[PDB]
């Protein structure tokens, strides 16, 4: 904040819901709760410039956790290769992935 009345008086009008692992109703953690928890405690006390450099590992895990850009490419490459094999007929679906499995509780 441009003025720090919030830090001076110790009150928290909006500082308790800045991000995902902040105060959540009935202890329902948000998605990527641990991952950006690691990002904050990596970046705390070292400044913004140092946060971008030596906390690149923790940020890249969280950025791909929330957006799933790399994971969608993995699942699409599974599906794109799979239907490529079905056109040539050198692959068959298993029973449990085609709808006839033995369910478990």
């Amino acid at each position: 904040p441009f003025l720090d009345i919030q830090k001076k008086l110790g009150i928290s009008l909006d500082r308790h819901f800045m991000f995902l692992s902040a105060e959540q109703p009935y202890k329902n953690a948000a998605r990527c709760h641990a991952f950006e928890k690691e990002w904050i405690e990596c970046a705390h006390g070292i400044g913004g410039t140092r946060a971008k450099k030596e906390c690149k590992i923790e940020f890249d895990d969280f950025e791909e956790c929330l957006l799933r850009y790399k994971t969608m490419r993995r699942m699409h490459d599974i599906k794109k290769q799979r239907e490529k094999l079905m056109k040539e007929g050198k692959y068959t679906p298993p029973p449990h992935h085609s709808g006839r499995e033995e369910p478990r509780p």
């Binding site: 308790h16 819901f17 109703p25």
Partner: protein
Amino acid sequence: MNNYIFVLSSLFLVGCLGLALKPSPIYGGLGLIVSGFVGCLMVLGFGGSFLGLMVFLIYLGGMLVVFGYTTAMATEEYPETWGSNWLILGFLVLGVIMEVFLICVLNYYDEVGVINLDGLGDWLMYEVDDVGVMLEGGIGVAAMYSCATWMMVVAGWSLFAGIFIIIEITRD
């Protein structure tokens, strides 16, 4: 039932496209209500019923007031709809054609980017806690009564002030 949310959001885009093409404000309100209904169903599709139903009801009331004002003073002798001018239908059909062209380009050239046909619907619900109580969207807005004191007081003061604002504006 995988491209349901996608055809919903395409309906939202064409409603906003008609609103941007700007017919007479009665038909603009018609497009805005059908787009608000689409947005309600979209929020319902991605999750809790509370936010979608509230935005739906609020814009029922809001464009109720708006349509009252279009009948009041935002009117002319011959209203222009979408089909009143050849230009408006022209930009409407080029908007639909450009939307189809853009989604085909994003499907083909960029592969897995913002739009993926093979991956459509596979990334709709990311993670939901299967065993658990109090997960709906209304519980958070309810906790805004307790956890968000500052949000409650600024919203209440905004509406209070705005009552005073509209009184002084329409004081005449």
